[PDB]
Amino acid sequence: MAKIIVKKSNPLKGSVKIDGAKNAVLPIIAATLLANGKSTLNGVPNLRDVHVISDLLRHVGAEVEYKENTLTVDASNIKTCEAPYELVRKMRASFLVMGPLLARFNSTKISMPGGCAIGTRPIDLHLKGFKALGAKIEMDHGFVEAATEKLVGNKLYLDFPSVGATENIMMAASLAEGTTIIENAAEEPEIVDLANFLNEMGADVKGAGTNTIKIKGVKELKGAEHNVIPDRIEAATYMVAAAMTKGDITVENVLMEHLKPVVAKLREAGCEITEMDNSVRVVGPKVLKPIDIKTLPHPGFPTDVQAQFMAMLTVANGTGVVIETVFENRFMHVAEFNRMGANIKIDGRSAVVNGVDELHGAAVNATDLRAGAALILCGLIAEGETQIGEIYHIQRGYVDIDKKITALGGQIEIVE
Amino acid sequence: MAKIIVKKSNPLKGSVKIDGAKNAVLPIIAATLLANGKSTLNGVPNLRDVHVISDLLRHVGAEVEYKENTLTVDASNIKTCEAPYELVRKMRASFLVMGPLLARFNSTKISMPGGCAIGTRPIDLHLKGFKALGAKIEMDHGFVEAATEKLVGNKLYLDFPSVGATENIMMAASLAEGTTIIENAAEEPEIVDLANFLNEMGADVKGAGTNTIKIKGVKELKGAEHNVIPDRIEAATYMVAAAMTKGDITVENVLMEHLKPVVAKLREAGCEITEMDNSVRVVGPKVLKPIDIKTLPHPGFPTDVQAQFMAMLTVANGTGVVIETVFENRFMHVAEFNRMGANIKIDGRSAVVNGVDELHGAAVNATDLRAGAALILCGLIAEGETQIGEIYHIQRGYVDIDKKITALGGQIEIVE
Amino acid sequence: MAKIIVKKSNPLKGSVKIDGAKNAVLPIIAATLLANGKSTLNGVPNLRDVHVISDLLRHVGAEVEYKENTLTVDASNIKTCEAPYELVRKMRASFLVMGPLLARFNSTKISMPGGCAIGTRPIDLHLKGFKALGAKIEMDHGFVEAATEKLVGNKLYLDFPSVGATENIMMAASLAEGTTIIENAAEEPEIVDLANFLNEMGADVKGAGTNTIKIKGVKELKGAEHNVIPDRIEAATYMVAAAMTKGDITVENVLMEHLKPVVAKLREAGCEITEMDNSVRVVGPKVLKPIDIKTLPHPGFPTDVQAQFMAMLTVANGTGVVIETVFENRFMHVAEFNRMGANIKIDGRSAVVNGVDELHGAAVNATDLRAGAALILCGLIAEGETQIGEIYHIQRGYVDIDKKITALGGQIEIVE
Amino acid sequence: MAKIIVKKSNPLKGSVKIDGAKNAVLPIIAATLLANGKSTLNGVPNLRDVHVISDLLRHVGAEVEYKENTLTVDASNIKTCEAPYELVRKMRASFLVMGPLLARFNSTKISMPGGCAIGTRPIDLHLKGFKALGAKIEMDHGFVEAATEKLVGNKLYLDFPSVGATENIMMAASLAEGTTIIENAAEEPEIVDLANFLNEMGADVKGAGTNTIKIKGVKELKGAEHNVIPDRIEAATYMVAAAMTKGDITVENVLMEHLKPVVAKLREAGCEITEMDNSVRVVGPKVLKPIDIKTLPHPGFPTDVQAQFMAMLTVANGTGVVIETVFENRFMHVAEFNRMGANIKIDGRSAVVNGVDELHGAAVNATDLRAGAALILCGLIAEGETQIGEIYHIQRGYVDIDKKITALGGQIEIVE
Ligand SMILES: CC(=O)N[C@H]1[C@@H](OP(=O)(O)OP(=O)(O)OC[C@H]2O[C@@H](n3ccc(=O)[nH]c3=O)[C@H](O)[C@@H]2O)O[C@H](CO)[C@@H](O)[C@@H]1O[C@H](C)C(=O)O
Ligand SMILES: CC(=O)N[C@H]1[C@@H](OP(=O)(O)OP(=O)(O)OC[C@H]2O[C@@H](n3ccc(=O)[nH]c3=O)[C@H](O)[C@@H]2O)O[C@H](CO)[C@@H](O)[C@@H]1O[C@H](C)C(=O)O
Ligand SMILES: CC(=O)N[C@H]1[C@@H](OP(=O)(O)OP(=O)(O)OC[C@H]2O[C@@H](n3ccc(=O)[nH]c3=O)[C@H](O)[C@@H]2O)O[C@H](CO)[C@@H](O)[C@@H]1O[C@H](C)C(=O)O
Ligand SMILES: CC(=O)N[C@H]1[C@@H](OP(=O)(O)OP(=O)(O)OC[C@H]2O[C@@H](n3ccc(=O)[nH]c3=O)[C@H](O)[C@@H]2O)O[C@H](CO)[C@@H](O)[C@@H]1O[C@H](C)C(=O)O
């Protein structure tokens, strides 16, 4: 089966256009379900995770059309508020329909997500918020059902600033009676994108981007047109690639406000970075300086770039410590990095990376989306040739990484 | 030597006035050093930690007078920028003078804090920010020296949103040339208090309370008058005490915005809480419902109330999990709670509290400020009599806890 | 694709015969490579992991025949000491050929294992021991090569009492010049089985079962006949199944010495256990008492029974804590248990299990061998019907679990 | 108050005699309480912890005399089986009288130890074993009371191979009716010393040193004479001191079997070690090679030498990782090491030590016994002069460290 073959490459040089944010579009697609009417989403990346949630909307009865990076959804006529096991098993982001369906129809029944490679990922805070809004929750044979005679706005505290719980609760609250206050909300840029979209549909959501979100419920929302923000994680991936290959890359169609910790940490590692209104230029250093990273809720360092920074660190000039506070077991890639000659030792949530002279190409497997991309980065700098298996992980969330890296001068090919 | 004796008490009932925030006043006192002139701080709590940092200002040559909750500082004539080991050993908050002294005099030499009971507490991010502003850092025999020909504003990222590093860097940046941007800043209310004070002196500090702080340096700052915010941690202590004793207490002279997670979590445990403009009423439940807490940077649940919530949980109707993400070893109190009949098991940063019928009085020792106060709370509900040693820990940071609890009906006495 | 369907079952009752130990036979099969001659292994379980390592021996040129639980290996004519990526990727136990091949031929080149679901599982201590014996180690494109002009016995310390490193080093040392001393050796019963086999072939290995193993190298080893010990992990699985179903089961063809912590912990949970010379009877209690388990090196509680005890605890009468010290991320099953109505919260290496009234059947996936078996156990007690996917995990290491549970009265079927 | 002043010293050279083991003598002193008669302990180190437990025996009514390294105890006439709070608070090893007093008198009431600097140190497994032997346990106001009409031998499993629980249970079982089996026993050399002593008094204890201990209870024990084993931890301290100072030291009156991991790890770091029947010679290397250490139950690397190895690593030629599995918070010394210019970062139970050129003398505080000794080691190699406070920690458990290091050529003095 299919592999990505990467060879030791030249310093990457040139421009790369960044696609729309996968993790903005997924909750925003779920939000379309809140409107009796037709929404139009532009800048939608052509990605499997997009197609999966689109098929979920079809299941519940919304009409969906995708072309040329525009997705339209007509959620006028919904026929069921049940998300079955087979769909949720494909992608746990499917859970994001629960808030809108609960809000529109006052009842919804959604398969509870199971295990995921990157950790045990409960959805307790989503249910916490729904209960705060008046919903009664019950479990039936793997399904979670939430139902209410009516949703009523209430104050609620998030024990962790969960991205998904903030999204789900904001969407449910959008049609509740009265005012909902989400305390200790996620501040991730996708939260702000979603809020903006809800407001575009007629909602009243204030404070997205800050630690407190206030939603004043409205009776009905209408389909709206929305331009999704750029993918900050994709952008970060290309930035790290410039860093690691001693390249000089201009990443186009980005928002620098959303990249702050990545910019900072790359500068600390010795990159020269030039921030512009819609683009950023990254020049890799001649010697990578070791740095420590600690993943945290935004605007701390993002967990979705942790594997890729760890890969950069495998050849830094010293010792770097990587600490993952956000996900449990987001170190599955370490053993793959070590097969390429890295020197990485883990205990608990910390990985000690002792920089080596160079990596060496080897047969490796992607374990998840972001780690698979880190493996491509290793492949660019590893002596000889690197063959990466289980490539569906990567293709889930990167548009044409082979084409984009090839256009920057890298040696990469997908073989079937 | 001295002990606090607590007996099984009646439900606490009445009003308690909260003092000014210890942890606002300590950085604000250090900030007075930035002005060639006289500042006036009102609402200063009469606490040892206050007196220690005041003696540090005297050491460096500022004039200090304290009376009746007003502290004045005339920092017109400073005579040394060196903070010696003996003073810093007393209280690691002394380190907060480093930023102002560096800013005023472009050189400062401060003993590096050593071990602390509640964890290994490095000051690397403080030095990170000073280096970003142009300071060269060196170590001499336990001292850290920072010096520059001139401080220049720069962008810098905090790997963790450290309270102290945010404070120290904001103060240093206040007199730097140009604009400093602190990314991933602490959002704690004391950060906002400090900022306000600096602005009162003539500074230009914007975004305190948010994840990004921008300071535009000025050439000189002038003494100003400031009213310190209320102690949210003290307030929380009395709130928990109402919860645990099934009491009914009105806590006076507080800011509800600063108490959000404590209010939320207490309501989840079954308290009835009434929030007012300058006061909050807490009615304890008849049965405490078990809840989980997870300490986090503000506005997450505060580490300074963790021991006290754990004490409440020792008699909750079920199993609660307490997770400390902020400090390493902030569980020293667990063994003391267990001597009073609690059922608490720790591994890593998590403590499993399995609620018991009642605690039983016993001889215990305070291990630190906030835990010592938790022990007084246990003492209120523990059958018989509880004797608490090492009480200096408590007296550091609570004004007249014996008098305030006595006025609420509790049985407490300090014996020498 | 294929599923195991389990329904809510009657208390299991009857006798079950236990197969030979998978994890004794795998290193013992690798050990056959040490002899110029034919070995005969009896009591070999008919398992995929067995067939995989047998195909590895074929690759290197040994002759292998399997029938009726007897496997013979003629390692007279070995044709290569290289274990290629495709084989090692299938099963990391393939790494166990490295020690024998190094010992026989003074050179061997083995693909370095990559990621595994249950954690990052380095082989550094294996290489440590080989280096101690005189081997020079190098890495080539994912391969580890060990070579020496001659192996010389030496003392070496294991930083952790690794099962695999003890095995690999014992086998390498068996043909070394002089005496090897393994300090802080694994004490697992499989270590003793392997040692016995090596001694049967002509080796001189003393102290297996204790914290120190001494091997006095010999010039040549000869094929021998060996009876593998019973599978203590399989036995434990059936014991837990009796516990959870309130059953009454006699587990046949076992060694009670190898089951001590499992017996102890099951008695603590309320089982009545009767230990006999070659069998053990387990009667489940009417109410399971909550217990805590902590995985450790033998004779501590085995990690391979951790998931299955956790499953028992999901319906215990209270709160149990499960602590995994041996593997990092051996909690992947928790989310699957929670889909069946369990109440389990994890942080770090500890899982808090808050017992529920009953589990409820649901669609779940096996994540690994031992967890998949735990899911079958849940399926036996869960109201309604449980469907388990990814069943290859289970079939790897249990002989006919469907047939054996069916013979005890359970409702289980494998569907294709 | 009193300080230890250490200066940068010459390579240590010469011989040092090791005293008797503190941690053998403490349980063996408690064991004297089992005999109606007079015991004679030789090779007793002149240490505060010794004097504290001796005063506890006096409290309960045994007659004690200490001179010239011989301690005699006549436990013919015991007058109380209650150990009060004041004594147990001084030293938690006082808890070791519980097993003997329970065994002699079938009732005993012992204050439950509270917090300790190096971690939360429950005694649940001690109580577990006593309950297994027939004792009913209750808590009264900080006391734990154990009482039985008669102690009856039983099998019991230790969830962790606790040193103290193994000791306490072995002593209780020594006079029980029938046979006690301790499964997953501590294998520490002090367990073997204690067993030997009990057997000297007339007991029947087999398997000490192995993972299973069997005690066959006897009706009465008689006073006996015993020679305590050498202090392996003290010996290790002097060994590390040779390593760190590039010295050449012969440590006298030791048992090499008890020092295995320390010898191994020191050789890995580059020491040349010569093991003899009653002595060991350690020659420090010219360049310390970085190594990783992981504390574990014996014969794994001892937690009591962890701080001292960490100190050695502060100037090793690279990166070393120290992992503490045995105690929670046994890293309090890290901040003190960092005040001397070390580069150590902790997360969880792991500390990353990035070796520096040299340490620099500074004012530091001992946090506990073994760390205080590590600070003296740092003081020997740190440029200039190091002043160590809170020296009672050290004096607890080292005989005349100033005199012994002075006799090896070091510059050390205790000032009052
Ligand atoms: C669809 C989408 O946007 N997914 C992203 C979002 O996941 P999410 O699930 O919402 O993230 P969280 O809730 O903030 O989760 C953060 C932490 O909080 C725990 N938690 C979360 C919710 C809850 O109810 N209970 C609870 O305990 C949780 O287990 C985790 O430890 O945020 C993550 C963090 O940045 C991303 O890694 C993730 O990207 C992924 C890879 C991708 O592209 O596929
Ligand atoms: C004077 C004062 O306000 N002290 C308070 C302040 O300490 P601070 O020290 O500033 O808190 P941090 O820097 O946010 O520390 C939080 C975490 O960050 C790590 N860190 C911090 C700084 C740095 O450079 N490097 C670094 O790693 C640090 O080790 C900790 O794990 O904030 C704490 C958290 O709320 C409080 O517990 C603390 O109160 C106390 C008890 C009291 O009243 O005495
Ligand atoms: C073939 C076989 O017998 N496999 C078993 C054996 O694995 P092994 O691999 O030898 O076990 P370890 O080496 O004792 O591993 C224990 C711990 O030690 C770390 N470690 C190990 C080796 C090394 O060089 N470096 C190092 O760090 C390692 O990462 C782990 O955390 O022992 C394990 C523990 O009981 C079992 O779970 C495992 O069964 C399995 C599931 C099955 O049936 O497939
Ligand atoms: C008097 C004496 O010999 N003391 C020593 C002994 O303590 P001990 O207390 O017996 O050691 P453990 O019981 O093996 O403790 C090891 C671990 O096990 C947990 N545990 C222990 C008992 C119990 O019931 N429950 C339980 O959870 C415990 O919390 C720890 O994490 O063994 C330790 C380990 O080697 C030493 O560090 C300690 O030396 C000291 C410093 C000194 O010289 O003062």
What size, in residues, is chain D?
416
- The reply to whether B69 and B6 lie within a common domain is no
Q: Would an 8 Å CB–CB cutoff place A139 in contact with chain C? A: yes
* Distance (Å, whole) CA D202 – CA D206: 13
* Distance (Å, whole) CA C384 – CA C380: 9
Write out residues with Cβ below 6 Å of ligand 2.
Answer: B 23, 26, 93, 119, 121-126, 160, 162-165, 302-304, 326-327, 369, 397
Residues in chain C with CB shorter than 8 Å from the CB of D211 are 187, 298-299
Q: Which candidate, C5, C4, C14, places its Cα nearest to that of C245?
A: C14
Backbone angles phi, psi at D415, to 5 degrees: -115, 135
Q: Would an 8 Å CB–CB cutoff place B296 in contact with chain C? A: no
- The reply to whether D330 and D309 lie within a common domain is yes
* Distance (Å, whole) CA A296 – CA B184: 10
* Distance (Å, whole) CA D149 – CA D82: 18
* Distance (Å, whole) CA B323 – CA B306: 9
State how far residue A305 is from chain D, nearest Cα, in angstroms.
20
C123 lines ligand 3 (CB under 6 A): yes
- Going by the DSSP 8-state scheme, the letter that residue A257 receives in this structure is G
- The reply to whether D299 and D274 lie within a common domain is yes
CA of A164 to the centre of ligand 1 (A): 6
Q: Which two tokens stand for residue A92?
A: 């746990």
- Reduce the DSSP state of residue A194 to 3 states and report it: helix
* Distance (Å, whole) CA C66 – CA C340: 40
CA of D351 to the centre of ligand 2 (A): 20
Backbone angles phi, psi at A235, to 5 degrees: -55, -50
Q: Which two tokens stand for residue A93?
A: 């982001």
- Going by the DSSP 8-state scheme, the letter that residue A11 receives in this structure is P
* Distance (Å, whole) CA D286 – CA C189: 43
* Distance (Å, whole) CA C5 – CA C385: 7
- The reply to whether D147 and D194 lie within a common domain is yes
Peptide bond connecting C299 to the previous residue in cis, omega within 30 degrees of 0:
yes
Contact C40, C223 (CB under 8 A): yes
Amino acid at D50: V
- Hey, which residues does B353 pair with through a beta bridge? B320, B344
Residues annotated within the binding site of D are 22-23, 92, 121-125, 162-164, 304, 326, 330
* Distance (Å, whole) CA B75 – CA B78: 6
Boundary of a domain, candidates D228, D254, D277: D228
Task: Report H helices in B182-259.
Answer: 189-200, 232-244
* Distance (Å, whole) CA B169 – CA A261: 18
* Distance (Å, whole) CA B367 – CA B355: 22
State how far residue D313 is from chain B, nearest Cα, in angstroms.
18
* Distance (Å, whole) CA A93 – CA A49: 8
Amino acid at C65: E
Instruction: Determine which helix (DSSP H) or strand (DSSP E) holds C143, and give its type and residue range.
Output: strand C143-147
- Going by the DSSP 8-state scheme, the letter that residue B23 receives in this structure is H
- The reply to whether D315 and D390 lie within a common domain is yes
Residues in chain A with CB shorter than 8 Å from the CB of D318 are 354
| CA-D128 nearest atom, ligand 4 | 24
C-alpha triplet C385, C267, C281: angle, nearest 5°: 75
Q: Chains with ≥3 Cβ pairs under 8 A against D?
A: A, B, C
C-alpha torsion C129→C132→C133→C136, nearest 10: 90
Residues 6 or more apart whose Cβ sits within 8 Å of residue D31? D100, D171, D194, D197, D198, D201
* Distance (Å, whole) CA A169 – CA A6: 42
Amino acid at A316: A
- The reply to whether A87 and A203 lie within a common domain is yes
- Hey, which residues does B92 pair with through a beta bridge? none
Residues in chain A with CB shorter than 8 Å from the CB of B325 are 325
What Rg value do the Cα atoms of chain C yield, rounded?
Answer: 21
CB neighbourhood size of C327 (10 A)? 19
- The reply to whether B104 and B161 lie within a common domain is yes
Q: Chains with ≥3 Cβ pairs under 8 A against C?
A: A, B, D
Report long-range pairs for B51-54 (Cβ below 8 Å, ≥24 apart).
B52/B87, B52/B90, B52/B91, B52/B94, B53/B26, B53/B29, B53/B91, B53/B93, B53/B94, B53/B96, B53/B97, B54/B29
- The reply to whether D379 and D306 lie within a common domain is yes
Boundary of a domain, candidates A168, A195, A228: A228
Amino acid at C56: L
The DSSP annotation for B261-324 comes to HHHHHHHHHT-EEEE-SSEEEEE--SSPPP--EEE-STTSB-GGGHHHHHHHHTTSSSEEEEEE
C409 Rama sector, left if φ>0, alpha if ψ -120 to 50, beta otherwise: left
The DSSP annotation for D224-254 comes to -EEEPPB-HHHHHHHHHHHHHTT-EEEEES-
Q: Which candidate, D296, C318, A347, D370, places its Cα nearest to that of B345?
A: C318
Residues 6 or more apart whose Cβ sits within 8 Å of residue D253? D17, D18, D230, D278, D279
Boundary of a domain, candidates C228, C257, C279: C228
* Distance (Å, whole) CA C90 – CA A7: 25
CATH of the domain at C166: 3.65.10.10
Q: Give just the sign of the alpha carbon dihedral A315, A321, A326, A328.
A: positive
* Distance (Å, whole) CA C308 – CA C371: 7
* Distance (Å, whole) CA B77 – CA B105: 12
Pocket test for ligand 3, best of C50, C121, C228, C349 (most atoms within 8 A of CB): C121
- The reply to whether A302 and A222 lie within a common domain is no
Of the bound ligands, which one is closest to the alpha carbon of residue C397? Answer: 3
Measured between CA atoms, the residue of chain A closest to residue B207 is: A210
Residues of D marked active site are found at 116
Q: Give just the sign of the alpha carbon dihedral D78, D79, D82, D84.
A: negative
State how far residue D155 is from chain A, nearest Cα, in angstroms.
34
Q: Which two tokens stand for residue B75?
A: 């920092």
Q: How many domains does chain D have?
A: 2
- Establish whether B116 is a catalytic residue: yes
* Distance (Å, whole) CA D389 – CA D2: 7
Pocket test for ligand 1, best of A157, A160, A187 (most atoms within 8 A of CB): A160
- The reply to whether D207 and D299 lie within a common domain is no
Q: Which two tokens stand for residue C376?
A: 């079958």
- The reply to whether A234 and A278 lie within a common domain is yes
D50 Rama sector, left if φ>0, alpha if ψ -120 to 50, beta otherwise: alpha
Q: Give just the sign of the alpha carbon dihedral D401, D403, D406, D408.
A: negative
Of the bound ligands, which one is closest to the alpha carbon of residue C338? Answer: 1
A160 lines ligand 1 (CB under 6 A): yes
Backbone angles phi, psi at B190, to 5 degrees: -65, -25
The residue segments making up the domain with residue A359 are: 1-18+230-416
* Distance (Å, whole) CA C81 – CA C75: 12
The Cα-based distances of D58 to B381, D51, D81, D281, D285 in angstroms read: 36, 10, 11, 41, 48
What Rg value do the Cα atoms of chain D yield, rounded?
Answer: 21
Contact D168, D92 (CB under 8 A): no
- The reply to whether B207 and B251 lie within a common domain is no
CA of A277 to the centre of ligand 1 (A): 29
C-alpha triplet D344, D346, D349: angle, nearest 5°: 135
Amino acid at A166: T
From which experimental method does this structure derive?
A: X-ray
Contact A16, A252 (CB under 8 A): yes
Displacement of CA D93 from its chain's centroid (Å):
10
Taking the CA of residue A104 as centre, how many other CA atoms within 13 Å lie in the half-sphere pointing to its CB?
A: 26
Amino acid at D372: G
* Distance (Å, whole) CA A413 – CA C153: 48
Q: Which candidate, D255, D147, D193, places its Cα nearest to that of D31?
A: D193
D306 Rama sector, left if φ>0, alpha if ψ -120 to 50, beta otherwise: alpha
* Distance (Å, whole) CA A411 – CA A402: 9
Of the bound ligands, which one is closest to the alpha carbon of residue B116? Answer: 2
Query: Between A and B, how many CB-CB pairs are < 8 A?
Result: 63
Q: Would an 8 Å CB–CB cutoff place D319 in contact with chain A? A: yes
Q: Would an 8 Å CB–CB cutoff place C116 in contact with chain A? A: yes
| CA-D188 nearest atom, ligand 4 | 35
Residues 6 or more apart whose Cβ sits within 8 Å of residue C121? A335, C92, C113, C327
Residues 6 or more apart whose Cβ sits within 8 Å of residue A40? A70, A71, A72, A223, A224, A225, A226
Amino acid at D391: I
Burial of D324 (0-12, 13-18, 19+ CB in 10 A): buried
Q: Would an 8 Å CB–CB cutoff place B115 in contact with chain A? A: no
* Distance (Å, whole) CA C162 – CA C343: 32
Q: Which candidate, D73, D28, D304, places its Cα nearest to that of D190?
A: D28
Contact B183, A260 (CB under 8 A): yes
* Distance (Å, whole) CA A285 – CA D342: 28
Q: Would an 8 Å CB–CB cutoff place C407 in contact with chain D? A: no
- Reduce the DSSP state of residue A118 to 3 states and report it: coil
Buried b (16+ CB within 10 A) or exposed e, A109-124: bbbbbbbebbbbbbbe
